[PDB]
Design a protein around this nucleic acid. Sequence first.
DNA 1: AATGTCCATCTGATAAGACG
DNA 2: TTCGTCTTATCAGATGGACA
Length: 99
Amino acid sequence: MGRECVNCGATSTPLWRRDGTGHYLCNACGLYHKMNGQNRPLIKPTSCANCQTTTTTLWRRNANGDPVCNACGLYYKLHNINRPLTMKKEGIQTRNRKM
DNA sequence: AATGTCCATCTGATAAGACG
DNA sequence: TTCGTCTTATCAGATGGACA
Ligand SMILES: [Zn+2]
Ligand SMILES: [Zn+2]
């Protein structure tokens, strides 16, 4: 919901980010700020091996080398136990950060 | 050849918010 | 209600491939 990059006005991106003052830049635009200390010169031209879902905000790799949904890779790394197919939840839930 | 830049994509930290 | 707990978003940093 509703975020448009503060430099290039992008609307989608592999992964969002923020700068020192906590403004939402797209990936490339932010990975540019951390590194160069400069607004990025615009001019800018699968399923979980565990729960078999095709929807996640972040893909990872199981101990094997295969893509696992978010939820899963976190679960395993934390319980050293494949995440039950019971914890499976519906749709998507979102959250509001802010430093 | 050999290094540097740009950036998706992964692994790691922080912590939101559902729920006991 | 009120407050810990636990799952897992959503941030930050690491790693690597593509191109100059
Ligand atoms: Zn941008
Ligand atoms: Zn999964």
